[PDB]
């Protein structure tokens, strides 16, 4: 599988512009590996800022630009405020699967909602069905991602679903652990994880796309506990 690599840690200061870098060990970081930046803020809080390359989320602030540099993809901070102390991370689609980028924890010296909720404990060997209600757009019309974290690991892409027919598809590694479903009516995507071990422990994350627009509005993450 792909390796993404980031600055692990870059510093500025308010009011300097700032770029990240997001490298693939498959060669070239190209528009077809549709990179989308996101932001983490403390406590699980993902904003997703620039989608396929250099497109911005709308209503982020236009300070944020995306862009490729040679072989990597960049993102770039033009006017560092205080609040953009973060951690931002890339991914790029690798044709059938999407990969996160180690994040980089810049330090800065000095309508669409995805409900989710916040913790759940389970024990071994059940399932669990975690679900993302959504509000402020048409949620037919817009797939549903799913990923974790587990504590101390980086993000992995589990699947998406389309709302219009319910098709799937998921990573190698949840291919045979998750089962993605919605309901139209509520607005509602749900996840179920069948066969849950301790390994499953983890803070899980629904986050919209569609074809040619990924990751662009997060829920704000369900931790799941495997006793
Ligand atoms: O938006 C694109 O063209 C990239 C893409 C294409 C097909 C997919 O199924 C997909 N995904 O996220 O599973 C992503």
């Known amino acids: 599988q792909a390796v993404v690599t980031q600055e692990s840690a870059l510093t500025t200061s308010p009011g300097e512009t700032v770029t990240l870098t997001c490298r693939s060990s498959?060669?070239?970081?190209?528009?077809?590996?549709?990179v989308n930046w996101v932001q983490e803020k403390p406590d699980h809080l993902f904003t997703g800022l620039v989608y396929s390359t250099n497109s911005r989320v709308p209503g982020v602030p236009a300070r944020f630009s995306g862009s490729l540099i040679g072989d990597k993809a960049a993102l770039t901070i033009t006017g560092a405020q205080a609040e953009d102390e973060a951690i931002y991370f890339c991914?790029?689609?690798?044709?059938?699967?999407?990969?996160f980028g180690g994040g980089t924890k810049l330090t800065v010296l000095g309508q669409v909602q995805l409900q989710q909720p916040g913790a759940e404990l389970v024990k071994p060997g059940a399932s669990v069905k975690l679900s993302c209600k959504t509000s402020?757009?048409?949620?037919?019309?817009?797939?549903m991602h799913w990923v974790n974290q587990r504590p101390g690991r980086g993000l992995e892409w589990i699947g998406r679903i389309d709302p219009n027919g319910g098709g799937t598809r998921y990573s190698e590694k949840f291919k045979s652990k998750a089962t993605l479903t919605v309901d139209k009516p509520s607005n509602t995507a749900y996840m179920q994880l069948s066969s849950l071990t301790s390994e499953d422990s983890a803070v899980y994350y629904c986050?919209?796309?569609?074809?040619?627009?990924?990751?662009?509005?997060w829920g704000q993450g369900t931790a799941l506990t495997v006793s």
């Open positions: 402020g757009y048409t949620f037919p019309y817009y797939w």
């Open positions: 986050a919209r796309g569609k074809l040619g627009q990924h990751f662009d509005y």
């Open positions: 991914t790029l689609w690798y044709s059938n699967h999407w990969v």
């Open positions: 498959t060669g070239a970081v190209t528009t077809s590996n549709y």
